[PDB]
Amino acid sequence: VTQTLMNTMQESSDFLTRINIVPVSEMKGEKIGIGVTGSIASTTDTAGGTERQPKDFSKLASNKYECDQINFDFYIRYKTLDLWARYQDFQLRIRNAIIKRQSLDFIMAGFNGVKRAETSDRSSNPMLQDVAVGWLQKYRNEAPARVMSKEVIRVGKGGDYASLDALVMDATNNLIEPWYQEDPDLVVIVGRQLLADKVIISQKRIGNLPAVRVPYFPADAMLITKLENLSIYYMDDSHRRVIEENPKLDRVENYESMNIDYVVEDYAAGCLVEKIKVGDF
Amino acid sequence: MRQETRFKFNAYLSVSKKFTVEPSVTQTLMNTMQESSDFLTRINIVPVSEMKGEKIGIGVTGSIASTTDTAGGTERQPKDFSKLASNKYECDQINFDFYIRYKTLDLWARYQDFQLRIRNAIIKRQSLDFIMAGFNGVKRAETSDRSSNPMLQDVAVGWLQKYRNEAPARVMSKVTDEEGRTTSEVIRVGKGGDYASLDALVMDATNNLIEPWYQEDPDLVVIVGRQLLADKYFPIVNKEQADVIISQKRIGNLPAVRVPYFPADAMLITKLENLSIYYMDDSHRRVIEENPKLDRVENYESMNIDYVVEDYAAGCLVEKIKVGDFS
Amino acid sequence: WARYQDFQLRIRNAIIKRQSLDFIMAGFNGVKRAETSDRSSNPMLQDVAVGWLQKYRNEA
Amino acid sequence: QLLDVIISQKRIGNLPAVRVPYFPADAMLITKLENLSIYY
Amino acid sequence: QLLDVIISQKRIGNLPAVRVPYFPADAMLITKLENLSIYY
Amino acid sequence: HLSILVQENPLANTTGHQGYVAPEKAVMQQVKSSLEQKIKQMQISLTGE
Amino acid sequence: HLSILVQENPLANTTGHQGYVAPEKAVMQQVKSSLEQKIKQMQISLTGEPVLRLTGLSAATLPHMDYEVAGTPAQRKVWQDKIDQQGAELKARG
């Protein structure tokens, strides 16, 4: 029954409908990967000689994922539950509000989070870190070959580069894979503190490929990849939802929990750059 | 000349871009493979029905007109219509063969539409493999190992080695003197090297090496890898100031294309319909196997091909290109 | 050529293409009307007819 | 050199420039395109 | 000053700038356009 | 003038047919940058009558 | 620098909000024009030891462009191959 809820949630937002989200029936295993492997062809002197031995397919290097639980909590004061009940549109307003909050929450947690520390607090972590491991952290965590730090880069005049176009060119030439380097879906996504005049599809196109911004990002970074290499795996049937009408505090409570895990599929058809600042000398 | 040929010729007396013999199984697979990638679209994949013979002439021209005093004197001796430099191709087999582990297959079998995805994946895996093996691959050696040759340079002879061994004097790889047999090992291109820039290089190369017939032709391309293109176009964009020049990427007054895995230190100037691959009509043999000795389902597929560039005097390649300053 | 399909069309198109190219080649070249016209010592068609770039250089 | 048939966008002498397939590169001619003819 | 309702194309702080008819010119405020309201 | 006379030689421009900026513009941008850096790093002193 | 400090004053820009070019670019264009005029009207003399010693024009000799059979290295290689062919042929003679 969770599949229907997930489908409606993805259909609601317009950035989720571009990404793919899948249900997993098991807990921790092999990720679904149809990624292009290396060469497979060869020749063998079969007639009176050795044996034709095949080569592997979808070779695994490190593809272990363990879906963890997440949950959110409601608190609706009674003094408010009648206001929205007055204006002729109670149900639709409530439903749209809650689903939009949760949908944006997923994405906000996606591009952030650096650990899985239980008993999180919204005091020290406004952006919900400490909630899970996200893509932009999973990259740096294992195999940090697509991270660019070198000491901070300068897109200004007297820096290591001259304009962000040279930066994206060097990035898509040196770090991404060549067989993947030409694809009609290789898009760049850029934060807020970097755009000058160019989901929001922009008119111009840095490098030679289109640019787009999404509801959230880190402070100053950039991600060049396909819009299908990253995904979320949710447990098939683990979505619990209850509503408790306790008047001890004159309120209404709603508890809801699910089981998810973020993961990038190919991990070689994407690159990220961080610590980018517009500063000359 | 032959029975069917004489009949068809007598009938001739009294899409026009691709060749089809008859509806079969191998030809269909080759067509569906070609339709996948874009580079294979602009190339000729020809089915042939012989283990060894002569190559079909595509995109060959010449000067055939003349005038002779037939009135009391010499006679008219016609010139040959299609006589190339050397024309003898030899097709042979290559075979790719993989296996899927039981765990991964069991995982994939859950979500519907997995067979179609696997088919498309293996087709895409074969097309790029044809390309990568064709452009590399000096020589063919039985029992090809894949440890010290990761770029797949031991399957079969490639176009580059074809130019290297079949027709020299169309390849430049050293600057020499009448006394200095090797004055410089590599063709250095820089502010002080043997050339001003890549543009002058490709310009004088297309001026001298290739023949005057194809020299003046609306269809010529300079196939080059990815490293050299970026090395040329990076210092331009890395300036402060005219941003559309990245769209077409012309060098030496010639349109440029890039293909994956192309060797970084070489480039080849020629028309894109001059080089081609031939394949046997019915040799695509495929078998399955489900041995649990290593709990894996394997498959074996074999096809008989041969790469061939039609007219050697069409294009030329330069090798061992090194860019620097050379003070 | 006969093994494949529609070979007569290929032959017609190739021969017509060579014909059309050769007229232009002889157009901006050619300075004489010799009766032998050996295609060895004259790579471009230079001994087949008189051309525009020769009529200009000769008449006016 | 000194640059079917393709026309250059930038006029050299306020006149559009073209390139015919075969031509002695060291020379050039200014004229119309209907002025030439062949009679068969 | 310091520049119905008309929007300036060039964003000042990467944020689009607007001007409302009546406003104390020597001041300014950054906020959304739905955060304000009147209750009648 | 000597720098221009040197840069005009055909075996000087490392750039091909694309972006082959005239040597005048290049040397002018060079002198402009080298002068602007000095005018920016310096300051004004009041040791003049 | 003094000229810039003067031009930065508010009561300086003759042009209004349209075309209010920055004073830096204005004075830079001025100095560039007044310098290029001088560099164009002038010429280079020859009364200097390191310049009159061996420099000046390209060179002073007979063969510059007349033969240039080798020239570019590609043509050089073609001509060298043909010369080797001719030598292997003439080896039959004396």
Numbering used by the authors:
A (entry chain c): 37 to 186, 197 to 244, 263 to 345
B (entry chain b): 1 to 14, 27 to 253, 261 to 346
C (entry chain D): 120 to 179
D (entry chain D), E (entry chain d): 239 to 241, 262 to 298
F (entry chain e): 148 to 196
G (entry chain E): 148 to 241
Kindly provide excerpts from the paper associated with this entry:
P2 procapsids are assembled from pentamers and hexamers of the major capsid protein, gpN on a T = 7 dextro icosahedral lattice, together with the internal scaffolding protein, gpO, and a dodecamer of the portal protein (traditionally called “connector”), gpQ, at a single, unique capsid vertex. “Satellite” phage P4 is not a true phage, but rather a “pirate” mobile genetic element (MGE) —an integrative plasmid that has acquired the ability to utilize a “helper” phage, such as P2, for its own propagation. However, the Sid (“Size determination”) protein encoded by P4 changes the P2 capsid from its normal 60 nm diameter, T = 7 organization to a 45 nm capsid with T = 4 architecture. The smaller capsid fits the 11.6 kb P4 genome, but is too small to package the 33.6 kb P2 genome, thereby leading to strong suppression of P2 burst size.
P4 procapsids were generated by E. coli co-expression of gpN, Sid and a protease-deficient form of gpO [O(S107A)], purified on sucrose gradients, and prepared for cryo-EM by standard methods. The remaining particles were refined with an expanded soft mask and without symmetry averaging, resulting in an asymmetric reconstruction of the P4 procapsid at a resolution of 4.19 Å (FSC = 0.143). The P4 procapsid is organized on a T = 4 lattice, resulting in four copies of gpN in the icosahedral asymmetric unit, here denoted by subscripts A–D (and A2–D2 for the second asymmetric unit). The gpNA (green) subunits form the pentamers at the icosahedral fivefold symmetry axes, while two copies each of gpNB (yellow), gpNC (red) and gpND (blue) form the hexamer at the icosahedral twofold axis. gpN has the expected canonical HK97-like phage capsid protein fold, consisting of an N-arm, an E-loop, a P-domain and an A-domain. Sixty copies of Sid form a dodecahedral cage surrounding the P4 procapsid, interacting with the underlying capsid shell only at the hexamers, and forming trimeric connections at the icosahedral threefold axes. Sid is a highly elongated (126 Å), aliform structure, consisting of five extended α-helices interspersed by loops, the longest of which (residues 189–219) contains an additional short helix. Residues 139–189 form an extensive dimerization interface that includes helices α3 and α4, where the two monomers of Sid interlock in a knot-like structure overlaying the two-fold symmetry axis. Each Sid monomer forms two sets of contacts with the procapsid, exclusively interacting with the two gpNB subunits in each hexamer. In this way, each copy of Sid in the dimer binds to both gpNB subunits in a hexamer, forming a bridge that straddles the hexamer. Therefore, Sid must induce the arrangement of hexamers seen in the T = 4 lattice by forming these trimeric interactions, thus redirecting procapsid assembly towards the smaller architecture suitable only for packaging of the P4 genome.
